[PDB]
Write a protein that binds this ligand. Structure first.
Ligand SMILES: [K+]
Length: 885
């Protein structure tokens, strides 16, 4: 379509021309049109084959989780709670203007709960969500029991070497390796039926009550409300932050001052992004909260059909290598055939249960996704005397120093496969948190053989891509990517459980298996997505300060200098996954290239695909890192963009460029210290381009051993003073910004100067002078948005002997009618031609056809959405041509 769709507010979408003007009467309330009540809002939208697909969600949604019986997850039918999310297909019913009509409506039903799933869900506990204001110390949790304290006990230390073989820990050199973190302090963990607090501990190693809900509601909540009162009063904020406004801003739903239960937050967050193919509509969660399910809706689905979501716990991904999946799964929980009521995701044969999804997109008939693996480990929930009582079972899985350099060798290294190994080591005088070595060294799950049947190991899901929160040195180095080998090349030692980025391309058949997994009766049915990969993607270490390397730096002491809008410098985040077809042609006989980009903290990730079979791009050499992923670090200008203010990402096929829009109005109203936020004005635009040698350019590039990449550039289009309406990327050379510098909409034209966009004030003024019409005015004597056209005098015909030629000959000779005017372009390479019309046997008229900022030509008959633009182009009559030859 020749128009740009601009979401005006949470309900209205307006169609805009390339001249940054709204099409008259195009403003449409899509919630009302979808026959949804006013509690609904637009979550996301996409165009598929000229139709508009809109995802809607209700602020009134109330979900319940009942442990007893069946159909455990349900909408709260009392009062106004049965408000499921919907996907609606709209069509434009008019040839003149925009008139949206609803074609299909798809309800997104709550997930089915099998018996095996419900045994995990009953004791499932979820960490309170990370906000803009969560500190590194907020995330820090008290260190758990050592490997020796768990297996041997409180007696002595010298018996490790002689008793480790009985507990299957042969040659394990780490009796003081941590088995996890305590759940009696720190960030709140809540059951599906429970609610998270609006309070965040400043120091989670001392404050907060962890999973101790009763301890929070009886003593600590009073302490928190006293220290951190919500604004009206003036509080202290010595011990807790009050992030209520930051929680509302990331989609946390409330009943006055109380957040709704966890399952409501999960349902509401899970219906945030959509992607459309010929057969399917796919719905995924947002990047603020972990999601446990996604919807695969068959476009053929009949009206008033409940569309069921598929659990990620039933969705087996290819993590790159089987060991990579084994690392994640072994740390999910304790799996043992001789234990009663010890149900977790591992013991019940489920896979990774949750992700922080960056987004979803479609290219051809393929779905592309990405996200971070949300941390998920086992925890001891028993009551009486357990050594790990109220402790989460988590440990570092960073590759050892003596590992062979080569991607496959590093990621399949056995270090920390089944249990703890890393911590603190000093060989001669060289210190490392990582083991120097890998019969063989034995790792084992942190459950002692005696308390095997009497143990209750359940599941937890973290709010970030970290598994282990334990306040020790290894945690910092794992989260920041600071573990390096002592070899000549000095390679980075990867984690296999912390900061794991996930991505893939999903086919129609893989979507069909997810749909049957979602509709399966009885026991769980599984889906395998084979064109997926994983990647250790830590946060930049330069987002932190004062780290000791040669007393160690832990989470409770780590100083954040993160410039990207987060108070923390340890948890990764991603946003705006967007795919795009490369406009650059491939060699004959090869399919058109396409890729995807996504923003992460401190850089852009590029995803690479082989379009020959819609697979991930790969290379034969296993020593090379999977070439379907490439990470490019941001410079200071990109790192300064507040990633929590991401509004939207668009791709332009002609330019081959992605445009990421950031809107500062998306910032919360108040701080964690209940202080009004004042830098909520303005916006920013990041432009992403591809870099490197692409596939199928010539015979030499039919195979690749180097991953194509991307480059994010804070383009020069930004403001700290205007309220943004929209950014129109007209061409590689120009962008139009619609903003309010008051209550009224203003048009600003930004011109691309050798990679850097700069405001062109004279062009802005030309474009904005439309006199209430849809397009910029036309003035004869001015070099305006249409350049300047000066017509030759009629005397040119006699002087050049063109009078001997006929009207029909002149009209059929482009080079001649180009000599009837002189053009002055308003911008370099702006083109103009004359359109000729016979008026009589001896005369014709000419009218210019002129290129605008979008690269398109406009003339007297031009329309947008079928509406005549009536620009005001002149007509010039030339007379005195021969009647016949
Ligand atoms: K002009």
């Amino acid at each position: 379509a020749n128009t740009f769709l601009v979401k005006e507010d949470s309900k209205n979408v307006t169609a805009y021309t390339p001249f940054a003007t709204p099409i008259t009467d195009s403003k449409s309330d899509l919630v009302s049109l979808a026959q949804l009540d006013s509690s609904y809002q637009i979550a996301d939208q996409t165009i598929h084959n000229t139709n508009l697909f809109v995802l809607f969600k209700s602020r009134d949604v109330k979900v319940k989780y009942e442990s007893s019986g069946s159909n455990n997850i349900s909408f709260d039918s009392t009062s106004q709670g049965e408000k499921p999310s919907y996907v609606v297909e709209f069509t434009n019913s008019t040839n003149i203007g925009i008139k949206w009509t609803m074609v299909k409506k798809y309800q997104l039903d709550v997930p089915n709960v099998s018996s095996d799933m419900n045994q995990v869900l009953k004791n499932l506990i979820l960490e309170q969500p990370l906000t803009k204001y969560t500190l590194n110390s907020s995330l820090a949790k008290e260190k758990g029991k050592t490997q020796r304290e768990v297996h041997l006990g409180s007696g002595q230390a010298n018996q490790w070497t002689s008793q480790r073989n009985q507990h299957d820990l042969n040659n394990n050199p780490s009796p003081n390796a941590s088995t996890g973190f305590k759940l009696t302090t720190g960030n709140a963990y809540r059951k599906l039926s429970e609610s998270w607090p609006i309070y965040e501990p400043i120091d989670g190693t001392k404050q907060g009550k962890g999973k101790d809900s009763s301890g929070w509601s009886s003593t600590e909540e009073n302490e928190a409300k006293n220290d951190a009162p919500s604004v009206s009063s003036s509080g202290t904020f010595n011990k807790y932050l009050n992030t209520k406004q930051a929680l509302e801003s990331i989609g946390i739903l409330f009943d006055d001052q109380t957040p709704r239960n966890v399952i409501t937050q999960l349902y509401y967050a899970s219906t945030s992004k959509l992607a459309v193919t010929n057969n399917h509509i796919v719905v995924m969660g947002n990047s603020f909260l972990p999601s446990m399910w996604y919807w695969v809706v068959e476009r053929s689905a009949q009206e008033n059909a409940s569309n069921k979501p598929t659990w990620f716990a039933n969705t087996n991904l290819d993590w790159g290598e089987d060991k990579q999946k084994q690392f994640v799964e072994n740390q999910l929980g304790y799996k043992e055939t001789t234990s009663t009521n010890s149900h977790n995701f591992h013991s019940k044969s489920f896979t990774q249960p949750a992700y922080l999804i960056s987004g979803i997109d479609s290219v051809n008939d393929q779905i592309i996704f990405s996200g971070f693996k949300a941390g998920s480990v086992g925890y001891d929930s028993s009551s009486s005397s357990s050594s790990t009582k109220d402790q989460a079972l988590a440990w570092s899985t960073t590759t050892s120093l003596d590992s062979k350099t080569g991607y496959k060798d590093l990621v399949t290294n056995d270090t920390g496969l089944n249990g703890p190994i890393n911590g603190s080591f000093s060989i001669q005088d060289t210190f490392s948190f990582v083991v120097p070595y890998s019969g063989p060294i034995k790792t084992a799950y942190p459950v002692k053989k005696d308390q095997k049947s009497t143990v209750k190991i359940n599941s937890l899901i973290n709010a970030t891509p970290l598994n282990s929160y334990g306040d020790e040195g290894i945690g910092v180095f794992d989260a920041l990517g600071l573990n390096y080998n002592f070899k000549s090349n000095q390679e980075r030692l990867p984690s296999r459980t912390d900061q794991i980025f996930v991505y893939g391309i999903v086919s129609p058949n893989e979507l069909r298996s997810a749909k049957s997994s979602a509709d399966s009766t009885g026991s769980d049915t599984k889906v395998n997505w084979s064109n997926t990969q994983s990647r250790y993607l830590p946060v930049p270490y330069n987002y932190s300060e004062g780290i000791i390397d040669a007393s160690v730096t832990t989470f409770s002491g780590l100083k954040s200098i993160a410039p990207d809008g987060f108070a923390n410098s340890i948890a990764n985040f991603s946003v705006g996954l967007k795919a795009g077809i490369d406009p650059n042609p491939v060699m004959s006989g090869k399919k058109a290239n396409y890729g995807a980009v996504v923003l992460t903290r401190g850089g852009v990730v590029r995803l690479n695909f082989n379009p020959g079979n819609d697979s991930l791009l790969s290379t034969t050499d296993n020593n090379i890192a999977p070439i379907s992923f490439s990470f490019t670090p941001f410079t200071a200008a990109e790192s300064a963009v507040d990633l929590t203010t991401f509004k939207e990402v668009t791709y332009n096929q002609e330019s081959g460029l992605w445009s990421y829009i950031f809107d500062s109005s998306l910032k919360p109203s108040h701080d964690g210290k209940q202080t009004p936020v004042t830098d909520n004005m303005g916006f920013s635009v990041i432009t992403v381009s591809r870099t490197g040698i692409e596939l199928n350019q010539d015979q030499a590039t039919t195979t690749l051993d180097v991953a194509p990449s991307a480059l994010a550039v804070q383009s020069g289009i930004q403001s700290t003073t205007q309220t943004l309406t929209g950014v129109l990327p007209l061409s590689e050379e120009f962008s139009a910004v619609i903003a309010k510098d008051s209550d009224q909409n203003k048009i600003d034209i930004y011109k691309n100067n050798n990679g850097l966009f700069e405001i062109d004030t004279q062009l802005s003024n030309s474009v904005a002078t439309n006199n209430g019409g849809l397009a910029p005015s036309y003035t004869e004597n001015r070099v305006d948005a249409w350049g300047k056209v000066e017509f030759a005098d009629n005397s040119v015909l006699q002087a050049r002997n063109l009078v001997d030629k006929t009207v029909d000959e002149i009209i059929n000779t482009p080079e001649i009618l180009n000599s009837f005017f002189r053009f002055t372009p308003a911008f370099e390479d702006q083109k103009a031609t004359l359109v000729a019309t016979k008026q009589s046997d001896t005369s014709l008229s000419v009218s210019p056809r002129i290129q605008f900022l979008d690269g398109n030509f406009y003339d007297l008959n031009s329309t947008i959405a079928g509406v005549p633009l009536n620009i005001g182009f002149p007509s010039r009559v030339f007379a005195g041509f021969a009647a016949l030859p």
